[PDB]
């Protein structure tokens, strides 16, 4: 897979993320973590207070498609930031070899 081919799949996966985000807002319930697109994959609805695990997306060629990326959803319904930094916490170490 080439670089430009990989970018096209990311744009496709980004479009389906906007659909899943526009639809969940059209059918609301409770206070969960809302779907987000972090330029790699589309994080789904997260249960408050739990770690959210997503399979490493198969449209990324260099990913280990048998692993999982992880996020933290707090009981308030917002994705947890990294301690000491203003960035959303995410662990992609299972997906790549250089981590």
């Amino acid at each position: 897979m080439t670089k430009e081919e990989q970018i096209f799949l990311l744009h496709r996966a980004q479009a389906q993320c906007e659909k899943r985000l526009k639809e969940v807002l059209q059918r609301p319930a409770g206070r969960p973590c809302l779907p987000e697109w972090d330029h790699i994959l589309c994080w789904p609805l997260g249960a408050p207070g739990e770690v959210v695990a997503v399979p490493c997306p198969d449209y990324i060629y260099d990913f280990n498609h048998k692993g999982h990326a992880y996020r933290r959803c707090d009981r308030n319904g917002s994705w947890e930031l990294v301690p000491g930094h203003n960035r959303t916490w995410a662990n992609y170490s299972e997906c790549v070899k250089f981590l």
């Binding site: 080439t2 990989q6 970018i7 330029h39 916490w89 995410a90 992609y92 170490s93 981590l99």
Partner: peptide, 21 residues
Amino acid sequence: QDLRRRFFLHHLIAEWHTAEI
């Protein structure tokens, strides 16, 4: 694009994987 695709992913993961841990 053999290394161009991989080096492009380096940037995504660099600023993606925010757990400095």
